[PDB]
RNA sequence: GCUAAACCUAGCCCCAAACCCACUCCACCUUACUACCAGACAACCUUAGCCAAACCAUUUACCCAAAUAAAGUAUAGGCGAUAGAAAUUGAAACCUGGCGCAAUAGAUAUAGUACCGCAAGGGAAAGAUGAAAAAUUAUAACCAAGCAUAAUAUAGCAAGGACUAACCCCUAUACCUUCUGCAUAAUGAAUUAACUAGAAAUAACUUUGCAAGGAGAGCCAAAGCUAAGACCCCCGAAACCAGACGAGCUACCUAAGAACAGCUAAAAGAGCACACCCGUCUAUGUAGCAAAAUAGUGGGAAGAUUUAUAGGUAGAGGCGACAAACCUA
RNA sequence: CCUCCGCAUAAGCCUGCGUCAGAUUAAAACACUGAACUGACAAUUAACAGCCCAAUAUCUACAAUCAACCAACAAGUCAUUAUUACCCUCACUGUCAACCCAACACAGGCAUGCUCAUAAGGAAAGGUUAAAAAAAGUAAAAGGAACUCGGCAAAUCUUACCCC
């Protein structure tokens, strides 16, 4: 016999069935959207089209992505989009030599931060490339805020950038009274992103919390049925009584 | 390296149709007579017309 | 009493839980199924106990009665026409007393009668508006009720008389029951005297 | 080889292995640290059978009693039996309160009363 | 035995009364409580990948310093979704020769008859 | 009862009561030789000892003394067709003893072979059966194997 | 005529359609088939290898996005055996079978049953009268390999020529093959019944149709284009990687125990010698009692000795008083 | 007549020479009927070993070997205290056997106590004749290793020399 859907259908096919089809929008759009994330560990092509040497043909040119691995010391801290890489290197850099197996690995520095947003301090084995793009977005809350879901790489971002989109959506007090101002002017200087309430609880979460939280949200005891009982009696003999 | 003979089957009629069924037999005739017919002792010597 | 059977075994005339059935086919073998019409359970006009008649045979043409029918295999057997012979005692010195065994008939071979005029009738199943389901004639609008037969049981209750471990019936049907918000247990503790103090303490479930 | 068809019983072990199996025998009590039993009475079922002497019902039905149609007996039906009437007549009159309803037999929780049962405290 | 059928009767009527108690206790449950099945669970998945109904056994202690329950693992891990598509092709195909040999019996039946 | 769920017993809870118990005793004959007082039944693989006299002092009300059980494993060596182990089910037998000195014998449920009604069923079968037996059982070894119809 | 030969149905494989399921009560993560008690640690990882290039170290479609022409084109490749796209016109919703079979065929299956190992795992034949077996009847017989009915009768690869008759008369060195040469004393064979071994492209040959055009888009063309026919075996090794299993026999270690009469006991890793640990030699058998036995002649037997129980060390290794010895014959 | 055996404990599938009918067929290397069987009848009842121990802190150097002389070296196999709370009690697993591991009813192997031969237990022989050959046992007129590469079964009881 025959399958009726493909193999790489049957994800799809779970999501559109019953607890996982009772999601929000948002964050099956969220998830279902897959976008490529920015290059790493390869220097991707100017145009579409390059004009290689030796003839005078113009040629299509693609940029690959790099298979990279990510460890765990990767989802528990913040790094950059680098990582991993499960290479081959050969000899003296000749075809015909010997092709050794040789793994990167990434330089790691523990250093210590201040969220402002939060207004605590997180000791985070930070790399280089992940302080050069915190010092080009003038900060971390806003390198934080303003990269993606596939630039963070780790699960830490996402819960950093879910507690700030909730700070700053339920405009629950940060600091403490006797000074507003502060306050006033932190939740003025992140004002162009104010995501609703109802869609920055869902932002980071992975598919088996998100299954989690449903269930609780859709728990509700069950309700025992003498209520509806004497509900629809007191229903029924009021419509026999009216008329 | 392990058969035996099977066919294991008897030459007796039992009983087997009253034996806990709703299905009787319909017969066509009885056992032997009712009563058994005397003839007279004399029927030779008297087998003409009559006596 | 509830014997599974195989799911190709032959219904031979034998019930199922007799030792001449057990000793025809033992559960060793698988012999050739008999592939018989399969005919609903809406359309079986004929039942136990009327008259039929036999349509071709060794006695064409020839009145009777059914005594045992078979749904398995549409096998009918009439009382006492197409008959052949046999013995029923046999021993090793001494057998006799031939009496003849009925054979069973298909229902393509068996079509059933009126008692109006004693003629072989197609009879089909129209429902009528009364309520009930009978069965009426075709070419002649006749009604041919069901006939009466004994059941399994084997006993009537136009004679059935109560034993000393038998109930009445002015009791069976006394209405006793009193419906409110009481389980069985506390009800039958309560009722006998039976009291308590102390309670149940928490207890978890996982 | 040893056998791998039949179950685990309590023949197969060692000295070590026959104890701890059984033959799924409720336990009634514990151990101690002189190997004695200690048995409680309140966890040996208490078989609670009630006087047949006025009682006039045999255990096998006659023929002549008349057969009826046979249906199952729903909650809606043992609501509509027993607590219906007596709503109809406390609204009928005008004192019907839908803010307590715990004397129509109705419990909020089963904490409260000793046979519960949706935990099922008794046994059967 | 002289009379084997009393023993069937008595066996149907003890049948009939422990569903007639049981159909009660569950309409007194639900016009309490309002929950079918006494006994109380939820749908938990095991090792194997199997959907199945985990019963509570009750204990004393609570569940998260237990020391047995907490061997009592409840996750699939991936290495049991090939598994679980081979069972479904298996029973895919048990379903289409059943169909199959069902196709046939009826062309017979319209062969023969 | 059996295959029931027992609630857990707290230290300090209530009385453990069943009223629908589910157990089935049978009264077996003994085998070898007993004394009098010593009563031998077979009680399922789910029940004591306490439970028995509990059982037997509640609905017989008979005085039981002492309670000596143990488990009986059926046999398992009957191969079928297909080359298969047989497994028969197991029971647990008791040997109970009476308390007041009271004496108990197994009576016989069977030595009342006097029962002779009408019979059109199945006794007019057998009488045809016998009265052709005594009918056809004339053979004459004088007449070396002639039929004996022909009356010529 | 005994042995024994045939009697069709459980169904078996792929299509089109359709997305397929999982508690009656109890038991199931400890010694699963166990009702009841105090450290919550347990996944997130380039697959490799064989073969081919007559070796082999670079390389070798397998990568899971519907056809085709482009195109096997540019390209990559010890520039060689090979691998291989993209840009581009484009891709007509709905219908229930087998020019397949019938138990050595078709799924291994009536079944993952017996049986083998502690273990993963390997894993096979089954069922035939009949409308009425509640017809235990008299018939339907007749064919292969093995037998009596019905043994031999001198001479000769078992055969031919023959006459009035089996022998007697003459001639004549079994079968396929590696081999110049084989019945050779080379290889295979006891028979019967079932099964088993030439599958295919560019370029070629023949025959219809159309024609400077042929062809159901793409391709070819200074007599061409399309279609059809025709064609290229089977079985048999030692090796390597990946995923799981084993110290219950044997090597080592760990914790708690047991064993050793008697005499000389020089104080002893002393001697003879019971039970015990191992087996230097003779005799018996090598399809035996035994896929490693039987008596003594043997060494030890108060200690570097043996043993009952439980646990650990496993292959790119374990262990080793070092035999390349052992790791379930 | 043998006992180089047996009875118990330890390990092991658990019903495997008790009765009944079939004993026509089927497994005894042949028979009776039964250690190579079909169905029904029920054995074993614990006191035997297990199923075990409520916590907080603290305490435990002068072996065993008749343990009393002496003498050691491999330096060793056994024990409690103060406090708090707890007076319901006898449930569960097996008690059969001629039995286990080696494809078997195998001259193979199995741990401790008991009299080391007794009160446990079994039969080298189916019958007929004494063919040759082979294997296991007693001894022989004279030589006692002169036969064999070598004292190779065997019984007397056996000293010295060399190498390692
Ligand atoms: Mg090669
Ligand atoms: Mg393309
Ligand atoms: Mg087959
Ligand atoms: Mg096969
Ligand atoms: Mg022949
Ligand atoms: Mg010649
Ligand atoms: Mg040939
Ligand atoms: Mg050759
Ligand atoms: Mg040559
Ligand atoms: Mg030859
Ligand atoms: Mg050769
Ligand atoms: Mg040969
Ligand atoms: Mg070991
Ligand atoms: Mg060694
Ligand atoms: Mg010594
Ligand atoms: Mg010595
Ligand atoms: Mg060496
Ligand atoms: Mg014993
Ligand atoms: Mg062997
Ligand atoms: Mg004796
Ligand atoms: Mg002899
Ligand atoms: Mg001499
Ligand atoms: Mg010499
Ligand atoms: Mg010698």
Redesign the interface.
């Given at each position: 016999?025959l399958h009726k859907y493909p193999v790489w259908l049957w994800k799809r096919l779970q999501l559109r069935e019953g607890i996982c089809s009772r999601l929000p929008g948002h964050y099956l759009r969220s998830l279902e959207e897959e976008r490529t994330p920015t290059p790493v560990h390869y220097r991707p092509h100017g145009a579409k089209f390059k004009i290689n040497p030796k003839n005078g043909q113009r040629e299509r040119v693609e940029d690959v992505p790099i298979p990279i691995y990510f460890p765990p010391e990767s989802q528990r801290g913040l790094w950059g989009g680098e990582g991993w890489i499960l290479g081959q290197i050969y000899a003296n850099n000749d075809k015909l030599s010997k092709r050794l197996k040789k793994v990167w690995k990434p330089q790691l520095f523990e250093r210590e931060f201040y969220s402002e947003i939060l207004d605590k301090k997180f000791t985070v084995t930070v790399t280089m490339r992940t302080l050069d793009l915190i010092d080009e977005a003038y900060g971390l809350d806003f390198y934080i805020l303003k990269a993606s879901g596939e630039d963070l790489c780790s699960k830490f971002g996402m819960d950093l950038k879910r507690g700030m989109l909730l700070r700053l959506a339920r405009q629950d007090p940060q600091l403490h009274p006797e000074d507003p101002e502060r306050r006033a002017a932190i939740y003025d200087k992140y004002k162009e992103f104010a995501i609703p309430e109802e869609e920055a609880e869902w932002v980071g979460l992975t598919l088996e919390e998100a299954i989690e939280k449903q269930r609780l949200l859709e728990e509700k005891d069950?309700?025992?049925?003498?209520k509806i009982?004497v509900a629809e009696l007191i229903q029924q003999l009021q419509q026999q009584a009216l008329s | 390296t392990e058969k035996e003979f099977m066919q294991h089957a008897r030459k007796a009629g039992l009983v087997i149709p009253p034996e806990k069924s709703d299905r009787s037999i319909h017969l066509a005739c009885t056992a032997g007579i009712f009563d058994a017919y005397v003839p007279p002792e004399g029927d030779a010597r008297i087998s003409s017309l009559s006596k | 009493?509830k014997v599974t059977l195989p799911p190709h075994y032959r219904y031979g005339m034998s019930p199922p839980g007799s030792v001449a059935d057990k000793r025809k086919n033992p559960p060793w073998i698988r012999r050739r199924p008999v592939?018989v019409?399969?005919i609903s359970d809406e359309d079986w006009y004929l039942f136990c106990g009327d008259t039929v008649e036999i349509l071709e045979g060794k006695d064409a043409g020839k009145q009777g009665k059914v005594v045992q029918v078979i749904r398995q295999r549409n096998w009918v057997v009439v009382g006492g026409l197409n008959t052949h012979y046999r013995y029923i005692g046999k021993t090793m010195d001494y057998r006799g007393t031939m009496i003849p065994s009925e054979a069973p008939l298909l229902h393509r071979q068996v079509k059933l009668v009126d008692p109006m005029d004693r003629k072989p009738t197609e009879i089909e199943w129209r429902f009528t508006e009364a309520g009930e389901r009978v069965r009426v004639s075709t070419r002649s609008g006749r009604i041919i009720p069901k006939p009466e037969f004994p059941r399994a049981d084997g006993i009537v209750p136009e004679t059935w008389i109560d034993g000393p471990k038998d109930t009445s019936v002015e009791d069976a049907l006394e209405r006793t029951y009193v419906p409110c918000?009481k389980?069985?247990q506390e009800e039958v503790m309560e009722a006998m005297g039976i009291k308590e103090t102390r309670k149940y303490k928490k207890?978890?479930?996982? | 080889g040893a056998d791998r068809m039949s179950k685990w019983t309590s023949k197969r072990g060692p000295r070590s292995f026959r104890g701890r199996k059984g033959r799924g025998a409720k336990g009634i009590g514990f151990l101690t640290s002189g190997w004695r039993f200690v048995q409680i009475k309140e966890m040996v079922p208490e078989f609670v059978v009630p006087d047949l002497t006025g009682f006039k019902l045999k255990?096998?039905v006659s023929y002549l009693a008349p057969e009826s149609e046979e249906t199952?007996?729903?909650?809606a039906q043992?609501?509509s039996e027993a607590v219906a009437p007596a709503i109809e007549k406390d609204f009928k009159d005008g004192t019907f309160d839908p803010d307590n309803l715990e004397k129509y037999?109705?419990?909020p929780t089963?904490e409260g009363k000793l046979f519960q049962?949706?935990?099922?405290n008794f046994l059967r | 035995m002289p009379s084997?059928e009393?023993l069937?009767?008595?066996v149907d009527?003890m049948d009939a009364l422990d569903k007639?108690?049981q159909?009660?206790?569950?309409?007194?449950?639900?016009?309490?409580?309002?929950?079918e099945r006494?006994?109380?669970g939820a749908w938990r998945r095991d090792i194997f990948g199997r959907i199945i109904w985990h019963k509570?056994?009750?204990?004393?202690?609570?569940?998260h310093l237990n020391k047995r329950?907490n061997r009592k693992r409840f996750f699939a891990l991936p290495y049991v979704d090939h598994f679980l598509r081979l069972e479904r092709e298996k029973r895919?195909?048990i379903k289409?020769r059943k169909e199959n040999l069902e196709r046939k019996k009826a062309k017979?039946?319209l062969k023969?008859? | 009862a059996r295959n029931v769920?027992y609630?857990?017993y707290?230290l300090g809870g209530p009385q453990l009561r069943v009223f629908?118990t589910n157990f089935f005793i049978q009264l077996v004959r003994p085998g070898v030789a007993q004394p009098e007082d010593t009563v031998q039944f077979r009680i399922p693989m789910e029940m004591t000892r306490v439970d028995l006299r509990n059982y037997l002092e509640g609905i017989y009300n008979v005085p039981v003394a002492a309670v000596r059980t143990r488990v009986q494993h059926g046999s398992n060596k009957r191969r079928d067709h297909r080359n298969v182990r047989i497994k028969k089910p197991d029971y647990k037998v008791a040997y109970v003893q009476l308390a007041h000195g009271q004496t108990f014998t197994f009576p016989d449920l069977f030595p009342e072979k006097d029962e002779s009604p009408e019979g059109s069923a199945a006794d007019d079968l057998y009488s045809m059966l016998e009265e052709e037996r005594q009918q056809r059982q004339s053979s004459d070894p004088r007449r070396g194997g002639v039929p004996s119809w022909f009356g010529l």
């Open positions: 016999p069950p309700v025992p049925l003498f009982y | - | 009493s592939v019409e399969p918000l389980t069985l207890v978890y479930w996982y | 255990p096998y199952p007996l729903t909650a043992l609501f037999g109705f419990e089963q049962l949706y935990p099922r | 084997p009393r069937d009767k008595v009527s007639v108690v159909e009660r206790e569950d309409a007194l449950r639900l016009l309490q409580t309002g929950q006494a006994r109380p509570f056994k009750q204990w004393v202690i609570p569940w329950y895919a195909r289409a017979i039946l023969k008859f | 769920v609630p857990l707290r629908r």
